[PDB]
Amino acid sequence: SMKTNLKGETALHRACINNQVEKLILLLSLPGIDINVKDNAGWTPLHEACNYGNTVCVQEILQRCPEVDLLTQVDGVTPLHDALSNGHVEIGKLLLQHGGPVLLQQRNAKGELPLDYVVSPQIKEELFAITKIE
Amino acid sequence: GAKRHRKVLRDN
């Protein structure tokens, strides 16, 4: 595996926390890189980009990693939970446009669905309307 | 009220 800090965060995690898009693009081009790598608690780089609202980092992951797992979880918290709980609606739209409606069905350990964090009925409609249809 | 990720500290 790659080098980690004390939290188990790799350079991929750090780029996604720090919004280092150019660094991220290089790292995503490395052979044998695992975009789904987990830190010590289990969070992925995609979780970090979604939690912090780093929309361009999310876009780059989704466009450069066909094998990214959008259902990875810690305590049931998926990337879409992370994004919507922190109000990052644009990231939520990107995730749903890539992953389809299975993302909307995931309950976290507290029994929350990702749309439970969206108060506006009209934002909920826009999120559903952009969701990939398979 | 921004929810941040819980972390685990470990140095192997």
Numbering used by the authors:
A (entry chain A): -1 to 0, 802 to 933
B (entry chain B): 14 to 25
The authors write:
SMC5/6 localization factor 1 (SLF1), and its interaction partner SLF2, have been identified in multiple independent proteomic analyses as proteins that accumulate at stalled replication forks with early repair factors, as part of a RAD18-SLF1-SLF2-SMC5/6 genome stability pathway. SLF1 is a 121 kDa protein containing a tandem BRCA1 C-terminal (tBRCT) domain at its N-terminus and a C-terminal Nse5-like protein domain split by an ankyrin repeat domain (ARD). Based on the high sequence similarity of this ARD to the ARD of two other DNA repair proteins, TONSL (Tonsoku-like protein) and BARD1 (BRCA1 associated RING Domain 1), the C-terminal ARD of SLF1 has been implicated in recognition of nucleosomes harbouring H4 unmethylated at K20, a characteristic of nascent nucleosomes incorporated during S phase. Our study focuses on SLF1, a multi-domain DDR protein that emerged as an essential component of the RAD18–SLF1–SLF2–SMC5/6 pathway which accumulates at stalled replication forks to facilitate efficient replication-coupled DNA repair.
To experimentally validate the interaction between SLF1 and H4 at the atomic level, we have crystallized the SLF1-H4 complex, comprising the recombinantly expressed ARD of SLF1 (SLF1ARD, residues 802-934) and a synthetic peptide of H4 N-terminal tail (H4peptide, residues 9-25). The crystal structure of SLF1ARD-H4peptide was determined by molecular replacement at 1.28 Å resolution, revealing the structure of SLF1ARD and its interface with H4. SLF1ARD contains four ankyrin repeats (labelled as ANK1-4 in Figure 1C and D), each containing a typical helix-turn-helix fold, with loops connecting consecutive repeats. The overall structure of SLF1ARD is concave in shape, like a ‘cupped hand’, as described for many other ARD structures. The well-defined extended β loop structures form the ‘fingers’ (labelled Finger 0-3), and four pairs of stacking helices form the ‘palm’. The inner surface, formed by the first helices from each ANK (labelled as αA1, αB1, αC1, and αD1 in Figure 1C and Supplementary Figure S2B), creates a negatively charged binding cavity. The H4 peptide is held by this ‘cupped hand’ with a calculated interaction surface area of 589 Å2, predominantly involving ANK1-3. SLF1ARD interacts mainly with H4 residues R17, H18, R19, and K20me0. R17 mediates a polar interaction with N850SLF1 (right top), while H18 and K20me0 bind within an acidic cavity formed by SLF1 residues D881, N850, E847, W842, D838 and E808, with H18 forming a π-π stacking interaction with W842SLF1 and a hydrogen bond with D881SLF1 (right bottom). R19 forms a hydrogen bond with the indole ring of W842SLF1 and a salt bridge with D874SLF1 outside the central binding cavity (left bottom). Importantly, K20me0 facilitates a stable interaction with SLF1 by forming salt bridges with D838, E808, and E847, explaining why unmethylated K20 is critical for recruiting SLF1 to nucleosomes (right bottom).
